[PDB]
RNA sequence: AGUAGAAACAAGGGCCCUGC
């Protein structure tokens, strides 16, 4: 349940993660912003086809 | 009856033991007493008697 | 990890393409419900049959194909096959295997460290075995049963629990990062969510499976069956080898589950407070309201809020309804008359009025209905079914087994029925004394004749002797009730008629909103009353275990003790958050503004006063000591802070630190004055008193995201706060924002200011404030 | 649930429930708005939150709560004490530090639009707070007290989670101002069917609502039709005593012959001891071939009786070749390909090709279905059914699991019944038979799964245990293999179920045959076996089975539980009467009528009449079709009927004769439909000695 | 197998509770009572697995 | 009766006896307990002495 | 041939695939 669609729920969650791990667990800058680049280009991707 | 030392299988085996939480054991230090919490057990056991 | 990275790359790729995109942006999340359905759609007529023609193939199962190569289990062990590379068809990531493979698997294949958590995901199971054991059968005989039809319950189960309330609770001890806004049953029962939250964590557990079973944990599985006997949860979840039409295996199963036992004390309390508000002339609604809510009890282990008790059970007697009423909790459609029980089947009418004579002359008005109704009625082992047809007990047929139990049943129902000249010419020995209004408060005619029959059992012997006598027409013998309860006779009682067979007791699964008056008399959208308090036993006397009634009406205590416990409440009410309570100095590690509270000034005056200075050196000691470092006890510093307003002294400390009332408490164990637990960190007992610690902050005890639930709140969104974790939660500043990700598909901001308020007297005060 | 209310209830205080409940009374409005006042009001309430003002009095005056009349009257009071201009509309509360009305308004939709159209309404004239389920403030003026927000954020919070639980977060419980009528699109087409589907007399459907709405009850016209329509009805009501039951017409014909697949009473079987290491049928059935006597066998081209002579004698020799090679499978040649039905399915002709031209070639009518003709009592019947009620020899002939533990006399009780009514059935024919049929049918069935598309070669055998004698002689008696026969498939293509797969039986036997019962067997002198010698035949013939036959006959053990549970329905049923075990004394010495000789009956105890009833659920097992559905389905009637015969409970019924009809429909060509209706007959015979309501 | 313990009470492995006497209520129903005013034996609760 | 007999399969109540056990290993302990001095004295009660 | 019932089976799809 909630207000966001499927698409903005799964983006959230996954950024969220990120941090939540590389705060402490076992991952590097370099994977975060890795992470983070291939999500914000799938986000672009999802808003433009339509 | 109430314990403060776990049983063995072999030697209690005509009683059932619980865990009943913990309790307090008081030992002189210097010039006071104190207390140092331990377990506490419970031994449960069904006898016969007569006159 | 690379894990993470790889959900990454499958969301872009699916976002590549178009119709995926298009369905992943329209509508809310609710939508994968929807889609979950649209897939893996296949039955079949007659699985046994393709059972016995699947089984008979060389790979009839499917298994995952990484899984059996991580494990090397290989292919074609001695000559026998265990699976080959292929896709099924639907799954396209699985593999063909064959059934030998889950016995290769069984017997050398990789073993996890431990599986006794299995006695935990299924604990109903082996509650179900443990209690059989304890069983002591006997003889088996051979007879005919009389097997009575009803609805009962098969489970025996603890803190029998509602639907909505489960559903969360499966959230917070399994998935509790996805976990939602927590709501007012997990705030309240917070020992339970902790105590099914050790078991389950840091585990290697399937979830969905352990979810499953808790929603089996918590039901009590009714069914509608024939039955004999005593009627326990425990004998009805192995009825099936305890008896038959014509057989009975003997055996005793009294002592164990102690289920019947926590439905009595309930009951008991009920009593209690509903006679406590009856005390009262004109707010015993608005009292009994505040009493009941002004009370708990322990329920085994668990600490349990008795207006939380009240909406769950399914108590039918006189008592559990009132409250259950007050409570504006809605309830089944069974009637009350007394000591008996009814429920009524078919038929209608309504009220009208009547008048009677007490003495001489002296008219008295009572009510009746007018039309024909029919009943069940059930008194002590003893059945009925009855019809009623305008102030007369048109006919009636019982089904009980004892003279005693008939004569009491028949007559409760002709008095039910204003049948007899007794409601036309009262007796003689009633008057206008006995009328009514022990202080004020009448009593219809009804109840009056009942007291009447308990007086005396001559009084009840007259009664039925209002009923016609007449002699036993031939035939009918076996079929006739004298005055004494036997089976047959020479005269019996008029259009009455005998039975051996209980009657089976209707059923209907609907519910009705019911409303009371102010004298406690409960009426449903019409004038029969289905619950009363004269309907109750008088009175007696009880020594309750466990309980709580934290209400000065209800209390025995003296003042001094109660002065103490007061001080202590006051003194945790300063718990909460903002600035000058005691959390925050913590966290500045202001450890001398706690000295100063105006709270410890208002328990000053109980301290010992010929040594009020030794206990402020050792007080004031502990204190600092617990907040320079960082691990401190919350539940320590409010036990010793009531001592330290005075000022260090010299002198020999025994140990403990006393009252003036020669009441003490020592730092460090648990006596009869303060005690806590690390099971149920949420509660701290004075002199038998519970009272609530709020959840703002957590000590070394409490160990997550649950004890701070109460120090946080919505607010208007805000898109400058920054946005954080579960964890970093704890690394707020009292008064500070922060945004969220609340359960799925959803953000907030929250605040982390308190507000102790609620809703109820927000809502009563200003509707009161409107009858004007 | 089941009702607004009640859900509302849920997460309002009841009390806000019951004000909100009389305020949709009051303008009588879809109850289905229960919930958002209530939501409204209780924002109103905690708005108010018992606040004081300087003066120590209340700040915020309440008015949403109340009537309309009396809110008007307390709206303008309020206008006129403190000197205020009157306010075209209500409001919902009224604060005295500021002396000014305070709207509140609630909405789902992320977006002004609420707050646009109330700021209209309202201009500037009041302060106007627009709160949103999911955190957002649209005003007109400085913000609320904090504490004010936090609770009222955190309360629309939970509630929107709590709607969103329970669907009901829709424009249809949760409607703005416009969208409050939700109605079904009534369209254009649908109104035109609607006018068109009434009943006769009215011609619209606003007439019959009309007329349905309005409807008024008069009695003494229903009465009327009612005794009308009972006078031109005539319903016959027929007491039985006074008009009697004819017997059942059996039809006419020759007699019904033998139809199980197996040979029950006329079977011969080869014996040997069974060793745990050769355990599968294809090797049993090659042990039996090395002995030599399976070979000895050797037809002659003179059959007894039947047809396609030539084709049985080459398939038998291929049989045999085959087993030899040790591979259990035959070659497609003329024989086979005959005897399977390889090739003997239609050709299909699509229309789109056709032409009369071609139907005038070859006629092409339409298929005449030839329903099956009619038979005769069967007289070899009573034969089998004495045969199967004696002992056989061995015992253990259907395969049972173990007993588990007992703990309490109850389950002591179970085994030891179960124990002896087992041992009393596993001796008998009726026993080896459910065997044979368990064991070849599993083997077939796993042929046609494994091998289809190639004819296999399948044994007709059992096993068993010889008899236990005294501990005197060889002790610990050893097992068998008993062979009767040899099966045949044929390319069991079952793609699809109810399908057909054609085999063919070769038995062995010592009993010549005859016309009536053997028809479809087509018989051979095959040479000599000894016993003394003696004569043997070779039955054999050709005929089918499909997946359901195959998985019922598979699982044919169930004749044991409901024979078991008749027998011990009885005994318990007699021991309950007298509060004592009478079990043994009940299969002891109870006794039930069985037939009849020389004119008189028969009884034996119930401990060797179970077998008549064991026989009689492994015969409907055997012959279950739908002509022995329709007839057990019909007896029940002239049972009943019986019984209220016995009790002298004056029976009636409406027209028996359409009931006996209706059975002696259902009996063509089924042995037991009618060896069954026969029996029923002189039921009802032997009956009428003692009872009425039947006729001779 | 070994031959277990058989007195009816323990003698090693006790343990107990004191409290001071006191003349006027020397007697088996009111020790127990007493010893149970002060709240060390209502504490006791065994959990359910032995 | 031999009826009532024969169905509920009465016989004489087998007699059971005690099953022979091994030495204790717990004996000497328990002595070696008993022998030292308790912290508490003056468990048993004695009479007086005459003159 | 045969089966079964009030219609269907006695292979079906593209030499290969399969048995709801």
């Not at chain 3, 909406?311 to 309830?331: F, I, M, N």
């Not at chain 3, 059923?507 to 909103?513: A, G, L, P, T, V």
């Not at chain 4, 368990?438 to 004819?455: N, Q």
Request: charged share 30%; hydrophobic share 35%.
């Amino acid at each position: 349940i909630g207000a966001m669609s499927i698409g903005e729920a799964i983006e959230e969650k996954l950024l969220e993660r990120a941090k939540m791990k590389r705060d402490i667990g076992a991952i590097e800058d370099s994977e975060y912003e890795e992470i983070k680049d291939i999500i914000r280009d799938a986000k672009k991707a999802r808003l433009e086809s339509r | 009856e109430f314990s403060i030392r776990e049983p063995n299988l072999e030697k209690h085996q005509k009683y059932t033991v619980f865990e009943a939480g913990h309790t307090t054991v008081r030992m002189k230090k210097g010039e006071s007493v104190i207390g140092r919490e331990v377990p506490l057990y419970l031994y449960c056991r069904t006898t016969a008697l007569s006159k | 990890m690379s894990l993470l990275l790889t959900i990454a790359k499958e969301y872009k790729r699916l976002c590549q393409d178009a119709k995926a995109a298009q369905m992943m942006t329209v509508g809310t999340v609710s939508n994968y419900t929807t889609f979950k359905k649209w897939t893996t759609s296949r039955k079949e007529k007659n699985p046994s049959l393709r059972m016995r023609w699947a089984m008979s193939s060389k790979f009839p199962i499917i298994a995952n194909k990484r899984m059996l190569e991580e494990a090397q289990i290989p292919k074609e062990h001695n000559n026998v096959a265990l699976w080959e590379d292929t896709e099924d068809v639907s799954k396209r990531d699985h593999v063909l295997a064959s059934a030998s493979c889950i016995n290769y698997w069984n017997f050398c294949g990789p073993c996890v460290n431990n599986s006794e958590v299995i006695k935990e995901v299924y604990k109903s199971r082996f509650g179900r075995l443990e209690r059989r054991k304890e069983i002591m059968w006997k003889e088996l005989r051979f007879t005919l049963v009389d097997r009575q039809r009803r609805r009962v319950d098969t489970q025996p189960v603890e803190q029998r629990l509602r639907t909505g309330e489960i559903k969360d609770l499966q959230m917070w001890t399994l998935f509790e990062d996805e976990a939602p806004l927590a709501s007012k049953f997990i705030l309240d029962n917070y020992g339970l969510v902790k105590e099914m939250r050790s078991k389950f964590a840091n585990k290697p557990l399937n979830k969905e499976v352990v979810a499953h079973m808790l929603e089996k944990q918590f039901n009590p599985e009714s069914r509608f069956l024939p039955v004999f006997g005593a009627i326990r949860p425990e004998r009805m979840e192995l009825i099936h080898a305890l008896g038959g039409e014509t057989w009975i295996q003997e055996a005793n199963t009294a002592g164990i589950s102690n289920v019947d036992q926590r439905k009595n004390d309930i009951r008991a309390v009920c009593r209690k407070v509903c006679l406590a508000a009856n005390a009262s002339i004109m707010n015993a609604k608005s009292k009994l309201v505040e009493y009941i809510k002004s009370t708990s009890m322990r329920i085994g282990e668990t600490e349990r809020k008795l207006e939380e008790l009240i909406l769950e059970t399914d108590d039918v007697s006189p008592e559990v309804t009132l409250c259950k009423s007050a409570l504006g909790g809605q309830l089944g459609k069974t009637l009350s008359f007394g000591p008996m029980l009814l429920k009524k089947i078919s038929g209608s009418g309504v009220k009208v009025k009547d008048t009677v004579y007490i003495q001489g002359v002296r008219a008295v008005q009572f009510e009746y209905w007018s039309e024909q109704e029919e009943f069940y009625g059930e008194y002590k082992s003893a059945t009925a079914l009855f019809s009623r047809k305008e102030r007369s007990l048109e006919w009636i047929t019982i089904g009980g087994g004892i003279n005693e139990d008939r004569k009491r049943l028949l007559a409760m129902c002709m008095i039910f029925c204003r049948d007899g000249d007794y409601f036309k010419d009262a007796p003689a020995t009633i008057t206008m004394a006995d009328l009514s209004t022990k202080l004020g408060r009448e009593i219809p005619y009804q109840y009056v004749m009942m007291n009447w029959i308990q007086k005396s059992e001559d009084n009840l012997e007259a009664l039925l002797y209002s009923r016609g006598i007449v002699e036993t027409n031939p035939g009918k013998m076996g079929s006739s009730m004298g005055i004494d309860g036997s089976k047959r006779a020479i005269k019996s009682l008029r259009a009455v008629t005998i039975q051996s067979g209980k009657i089976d007791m209707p059923e209907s699964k609907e519910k009705i909103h019911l409303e009371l008056s102010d004298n406690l008399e409960a009426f449903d959208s019409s004038g029969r009353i289905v619950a009363t308090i004269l309907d109750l036993p008088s009175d007696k006397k009880v020594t309750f275990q466990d309980v709580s009634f934290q209400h000065p009406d209800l209390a025995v205590l003296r003042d001094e003790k109660t002065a103490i416990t007061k001080g202590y409440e006051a003194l945790i009410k300063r718990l909460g958050t903002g600035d000058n309570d005691i959390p925050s100095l913590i966290a500045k590690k202001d450890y001398l503004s706690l000295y100063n509270l105006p709270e410890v000034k208002l328990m000053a005056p109980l301290i010992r006063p010929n040594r009020k200075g030794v206990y402020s050196r050792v007080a004031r000691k502990l204190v600092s000591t617990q907040v320079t470092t960082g691990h401190y006890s919350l539940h320590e510093l409010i036990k010793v802070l009531p001592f330290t307003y005075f000022a260090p002294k010299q002198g020999m400390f025994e140990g403990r630190l006393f009252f003036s009332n020669d009441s003490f408490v020592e730092p460090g164990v648990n006596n009869n004055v303060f005690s806590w637990s690390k099971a149920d960190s949420s509660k701290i007992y004075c002199h038998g008193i519970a009272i609530r610690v709020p959840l703002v902050v957590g000590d070394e005890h409490m160990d997550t995201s649950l004890a701070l639930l109460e120090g946080f709140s919505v607010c208007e969104n805000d898109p400058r706060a920054p946005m954080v974790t579960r964890q970093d939660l704890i690394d707020v500043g009292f008064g500070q924002k922060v945004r969220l990700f609340v359960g799925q598909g959803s953000v907030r901001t929250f605040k982390r200011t308190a507000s102790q308020r609620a809703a109820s007297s927000d809502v009563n005060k200003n509707v009161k404030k409107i009858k004007m | 649930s089941k009702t607004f209310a009640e859900i509302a209830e849920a997460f309002l205080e009841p009390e806000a429930v019951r004000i909100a409940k009389e305020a949709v009374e009051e303008y009588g409005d879809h109850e289905r708005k229960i919930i958002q006042i209530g939501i409204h009001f209780q924002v109103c309430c905690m708005f108010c939150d018992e606040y004081l003002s300087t003066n120590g009095s209340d700040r915020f005056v309440l008015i949403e709560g109340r009537k309309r009349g009396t809110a008007v009257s307390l709206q303008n009071e309020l206008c006129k004490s403190y000197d205020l201009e009157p306010l075209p509309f209500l409001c919902d509360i009224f604060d005295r530090e500021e002396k000014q009305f305070v709207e509140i308004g609630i909405t789902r939709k992320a977006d002004d639009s609420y707050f646009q159209s109330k700021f209209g309404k309202l201009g500037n004239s009041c302060k106007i707070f627009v709160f949103s389920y999911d955190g957002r403030l649209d005003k007109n003026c400085e913000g609320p007290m904090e504490e004010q927000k936090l609770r009222i954020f955190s309360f629309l919070a939970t509630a929107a989670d709590f709607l969103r639980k329970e669907n009901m977060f829709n424009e249809i419980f949760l409607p703005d101002n416009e969208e409050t009528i939700i109605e079904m699109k009534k369209g254009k087409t649908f109104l035109e069917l609607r006018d068109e589907s009434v009943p006769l007399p009215f011609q619209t459907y606003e007439q019959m609502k009309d007329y349905c709405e309005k409807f008024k009850g008069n009695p003494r016209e229903l009465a009327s039709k009612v005794s009308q329509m009972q006078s031109n009805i005539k319903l016959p009501i027929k007491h039985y005593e006074q008009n009697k039951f004819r017997q059942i017409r059996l039809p006419k014909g020759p007699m019904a012959p033998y139809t199980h697949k197996f040979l029950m009473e006329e079977a011969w079987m080869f014996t040997k001891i069974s060793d745990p290491e050769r355990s599968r049928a294809g090797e049993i059935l090659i042990d039996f071939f090395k002995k030599g006597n399976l070979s000895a066998i050797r037809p002659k081209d003179k059959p007894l009786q039947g047809k396609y002579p030539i084709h049985y004698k080459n398939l038998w020799n291929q049989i045999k070749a085959a087993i030899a090679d040790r591979t259990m499978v035959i070659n497609e040649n003329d024989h086979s390909e005959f005897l399977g039905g390889i090739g003997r399915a239609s050709k299909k002709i699509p229309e789109i090709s056709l032409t009369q031209d071609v139907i005038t070639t070859e006629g092409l009518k339409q298929s005449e279905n030839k329903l099956p003709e009619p038979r005769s009592f069967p007289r070899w019947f009573n034969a089998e059914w004495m045969w199967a009620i004696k002992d056989s020899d061995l015992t253990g002939w259907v395969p049972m699991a173990e007993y588990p533990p007992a703990d309490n006399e109850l389950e002591d009780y179970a085994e030891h019944l179960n124990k002896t009514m087992e041992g009393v059935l596993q001796g008998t024919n009726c026993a080896r038979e459910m065997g044979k049929c368990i064991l070849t049918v599993g083997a077939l069935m796993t042929e046609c799964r494994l091998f289809p598309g190639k004819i296999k070669v399948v044994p007709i055998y059992a096993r068993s245990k010889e008899r236990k004698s005294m501990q005197e002689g060889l002790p610990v008696p050893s097992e068998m293999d008993c062979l009767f026969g040899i099966c045949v498939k044929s390319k069991s293509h079952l793609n699809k179920d109810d399908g057909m797969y054609t085999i063919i039986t070769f038995e062995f036997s010592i009993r010549e045959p005859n016309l009536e019962k053997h028809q479809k067997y087509t018989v051979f002198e095959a040479g000599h076996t000894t016993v003394r010698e003696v004569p043997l035949y070779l039955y054999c013939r050709t005929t089918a089975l499909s997946k359901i036959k195959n998985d019922w006959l598979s699982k044919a053990r169930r004749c044991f539980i409901t024979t078991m549970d008749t027998v011990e329905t009885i005994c318990l049923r007699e021991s309950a009467k007298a509060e004592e075990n009478l079990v043994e004394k009940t299969l002891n010495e109870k006794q039930m009528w069985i037939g009849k000789k020389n004119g008189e009956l028969i009884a034996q105890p119930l401990r060797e009449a179970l077998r008549v009833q064991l026989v009689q659920q492994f015969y409907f097992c055997i012959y279950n079709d739908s002509q022995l559905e329709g007839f057990c389905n019909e007896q029940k009637k002239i049972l009943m009927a019986l019984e209220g015969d016995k009790k002298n409970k004056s029976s009636f019924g409406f027209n028996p004769e359409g009931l006996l009809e209706k059975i002696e429909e259902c009996l063509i060509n089924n042995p037991m439909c009618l060896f069954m209706a026969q029996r029923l007959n002189e039921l009802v015979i032997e009956a009428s000695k003692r009872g009425a309501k039947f006729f001779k």
